[PDB]
Amino acid sequence: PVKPNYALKFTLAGHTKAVSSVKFSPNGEWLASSSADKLIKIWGAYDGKFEKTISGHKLGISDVAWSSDSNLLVSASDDKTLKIWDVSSGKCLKTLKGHSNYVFCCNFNPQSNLIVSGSFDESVRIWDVKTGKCLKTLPAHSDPVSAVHFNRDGSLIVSSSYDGLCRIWDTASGQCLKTLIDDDNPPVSFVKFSPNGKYILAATLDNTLKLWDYSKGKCLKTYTGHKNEKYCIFANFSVTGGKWIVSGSEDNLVYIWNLQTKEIVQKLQGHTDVVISTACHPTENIIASAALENDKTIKLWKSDC
Numbered sequence: 107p108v109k110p111n112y113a114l115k116f117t118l119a120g121h122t123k124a125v126s127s128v129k130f131s132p133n134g135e136w137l138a139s140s141s142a143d144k145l146i147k148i149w150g151a152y153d154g155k156f157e158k159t160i161s162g163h164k165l166g167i168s169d170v171a172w173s174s175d176s177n178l179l180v181s182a183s184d185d186k187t188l189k190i191w192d193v194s195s196g197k198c199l200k201t202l203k204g205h206s207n208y209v210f211c212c213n214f215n216p217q218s219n220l221i222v223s224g225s226f227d228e229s230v231r232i233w234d235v236k237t238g239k240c241l242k243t244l245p246a247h248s249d250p251v252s253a254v255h256f257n258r259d260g261s262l263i264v265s266s267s268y269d270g271l272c273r274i275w276d277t278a279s280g281q282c283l284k285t286l287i288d289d290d291n292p293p294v295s296f297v298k299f300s301p302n303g304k305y306i307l308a309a310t311l312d313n314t315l316k317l318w319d320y321s322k323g324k325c326l327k328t329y330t331g332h333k334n335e336k337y338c339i340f341a342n343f344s345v346t347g348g349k350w351i352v353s354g355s356e357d358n359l360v361y362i363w364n365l366q367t368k369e370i371v372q373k374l375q376g377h378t379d380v381v382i383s384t385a386c387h388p389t390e391n392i393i394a395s396a397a398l399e400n401d402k403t404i405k406l407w408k409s410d411c
């Protein structure tokens with residue numbers, strides 16, 4: 107496939123303010139979304155059908171993430187806390203307290219006994235899921251932390267910040283193992299490891315995505331054409347069909363690139379405001395996208411390749 111052919115299948119309405127993130131459950135059955143309206147919503151991944159609302163945060167939510175067994179969620183909120191949720195019961199199992207300002211990003215490790223978080227307070231924290239206690243506080247950055255992610259075996263954490271740095275941390279010790287710098291350091295608005303753990307994908311507010319070989323500290327690929335000068339927009343590796351990079355954009359489109367050739371292969375039209383978040387289904391050729399306040403909807407897209 108020189109190109110995918112994603113086409114719109116469902117539009118999901120219900121959030122009453124900007125959506126902030128969307129994530130597919132690892133078992134592929136569900137989509138979770140978080141919003142400035144202080145709510146988490148659960149939707150069917152294949153039919154787009156609204157399932158349930160999960161409530162409890164006192165202010166808007168910036169991010170949500172799934173545990174590996176698809177049974178728990180963690181959410182990051184402007185109320186300076188994270189909450190761990192039992193999805194089936196809707197119960198808040200733990201409230202993770204410690205950050206001194208807005209919490210912007212969160213993720214489980216693969217084993218899902220740990221949670222990592224990043225905050226406006228410029229720190230990265232590592233939490234024990236079962237006790238809800240903070241294990242480590244990392245003096246990670248000198249500006250707000252925009253993303254945090256574990257690698258494939260959980261031994262590394264990558265963090266990014268508006269200070270222009272991506273850093274790699276040892277989970278066990280909390281030591282800073284690496285700082286990634288290019289020829290220039292625009293604010294970094296998103297970062298994550300590749301599925302095989304060998305690479306890092308970073309978004310910067312100069313309208314650019316970069317693929318880094320972090321063990322060698324070198325920038326390999328570069329993806330442009332989209333618009334990103336303001337917001338924390340998620341980006342993804344799509345690997346179920348052809349190998350693509352997928353991202354939202356401030357011109358209201360979903361951008362899809364050939365991972366290898368860096369060429370734009372598709373631009374998905376339909377949203378009426380900034381596409382702040384995209385997610386890729388774990389086993390099927392399905393993308394979810396979500397948009398900001400003037401739109402408020404989530405869209406599900408499907409390709410034959």
Ligand SMILES: FC(F)(F)c1ccc(-c2nnn[nH]2)cc1
Pocket residue numbers: 300301302303305317326327343365366
């Ligand atoms: F060589 C490329 F193009 F840089 C590259 C980058 C990432 C991956 C990959 N596979 N799985 N996860 N990441 C494969 C190839």
